[PDB]
From a paper:
Active transport of proteins from the cytoplasm to the nucleus is mediated by a family of nuclear transport receptors known as importins (or karyopherins), together with a number of ancillary proteins including nucleoporins and Ran1–3. Importin α is constructed from an N-terminal importin β-binding (IBB) domain and a C-terminal NLS binding domain featuring ten armadillo (ARM)-repeat motifs. The W proteins of henipaviruses share a common N-terminal domain with P and V proteins, but have a unique NLS bearing C-terminal domain that is recognised preferentially by importins α3 and α4 (KPNA4 and KPNA3), rather than the better characterised importin α1 (KPNA2). In this study, we present high-resolution structures of importin α isoform adaptors bound to the NLS regions of HeV W and NiV W, providing insights into the molecular basis of importin α isoform specificity.
The structure of the importin α3:HeV W complex was determined in three different space groups, with all crystals exhibiting highly similar structures (r.m.s.d < 0.35) and containing one HeV W NLS chain bound to a single importin α3 chain (the highest resolution structure of 1.6 Å will be used for further discussion and analysis). However, there were marked differences residing outside this region, with importin α3 ARM repeats 6–9 binding HeV W and NiV W residues 419–444 and 421–446, respectively. Notably, despite binding the same region of HeV W and NiV W, importin α3 exhibited a 2.4-fold more extensive interaction buried surface area than importin α1, with 16 additional hydrogen bonds, and six additional salt bridge interactions, consistent with its > 50-fold higher affinity. To gain insights into the basis of isoform specificity, we superimposed the structures of importin α1:HeV W and importin α3:HeV W, and found the structures to be highly similar, with an r.m.s.d. of 1.1 Å across 411 residues, except for the positioning of ARM repeats 7 and 8. Notably, in importin α1, ARM repeats 7 and 8 are positioned closer to the inner surface of the NLS-binding interface, whereas in importin α3, these regions are positioned in a more open conformation. To probe the interaction of the importin α3:HeV W interface in greater detail, we designed mutations to disrupt key salt bridges at the major and minor sites of importin α3. Similarly, mutations predicted to disrupt interaction at the importin α3 major site, K437A/K438A and K437D/K438D in HeV W C-terminal domain, and K439A/K440A and K439D/K440D in the NiV W C-terminal domain, also failed to interact with importin α3. Consistent with these results, we found that mutations in both the major and minor site-binding regions of HeV W disrupted the affinity of interaction to importin α3 in ELISA, and resulted in reduced nuclear accumulation.
Author numbering:
A (entry chain A): 72 to 487
B (entry chain B): 419 to 442
The structure:
Amino acid sequence: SLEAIVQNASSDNQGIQLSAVQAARKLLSSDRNPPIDDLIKSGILPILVHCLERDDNPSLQFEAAWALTNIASGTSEQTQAVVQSNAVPLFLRLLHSPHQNVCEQAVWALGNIIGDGPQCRDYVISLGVVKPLLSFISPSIPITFLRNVTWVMVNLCRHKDPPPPMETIQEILPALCVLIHHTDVNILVDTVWALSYLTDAGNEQIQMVIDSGIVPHLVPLLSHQEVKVQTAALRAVGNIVTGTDEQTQVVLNCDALSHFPALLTHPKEKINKEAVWFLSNITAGNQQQVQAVIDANLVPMIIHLLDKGDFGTQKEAAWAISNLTISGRKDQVAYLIQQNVIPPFCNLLTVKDAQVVQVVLDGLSNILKMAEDEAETIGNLIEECGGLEKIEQLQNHENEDIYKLAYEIIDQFFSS
Amino acid sequence: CLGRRVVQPGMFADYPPTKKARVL
């Protein structure tokens, strides 16, 4: 029983301790619903943390580390009970254990703690976890251990309120630059996800990732054989192109757009959607970035998805079309018209998502304003597909930004 | 409200777990 285990674990004799801690570990590792709360309420935590100090019994340190790992794998309340028992400094000590199993289990426990949230992450960082963790990365490290190191690196990079300290990012990026050349799929997935958390952290963090030199190693993973790697890379580069035009151009200069036909035609609708989101952030750029999308032969594929994709993908394609009109030239917008954008675009005017309706009306207004003389040809195309009747109906929409624009479009372009 | 947009809800849902138990 738990009472018994706690009684034995509190003994001064390390072999009685070992028996008890192994029994607790087995309770916590034998199925996917361990009795975490019962073990916390029993009072075992400070005892287990005390066991971590016993360099004279590495088996006891290992068992205690595995037990605490699994308690910390639970809810935030369970992880925080481990942290409140002073586990973190003792695990950081065990990163220097001569015993491989103890060191690896300490890494794993710290991963669960760091993963709980940003303040917990920042406590562990402040105590110096990053340097010894990255010191493990070597040619001789066993691959299972390296996979766990890289997973902890994800947890160091994630969570955004606040993001991890700049100095930590500066320490982690050279290690990610090494790991991105690994061939192991699990290492690559984690490495790229860690990068994607950094590129979502803000424009200064995007710039740090760019300045590391890693982007040309990241872009070709869009065509990796493993779909998990491809989509991690799509997130990582996608976050970069939420930045400035110059930051976006770093990604385009790696020929990123040549990787997109196989993502836009991918069987998985979620990948189509994610790919079109990326492209919508390209077409929001300057005229040269708009032209890059045209020259990669992607516009017909976007328009196909606008018409025949799943609704989630259609919404993204609507953004890609409207955003082109921000800085696109008259001739680039004319190309959209020639590619039969107007009917599937207008078909989104009636949906219940007011954000999409606004995007489409904004793009139609910009298209009409840009076609100085051709405004009548385009107006006729909008009328022909029922787009004009749909705009007239939007004069009765709930949302003022929508209905105002519907009145204005009809007054400016259909009141002759 | 045209322009660049951050990653949207529901995208990239297969993120690495924050926490993992060692199970036998």
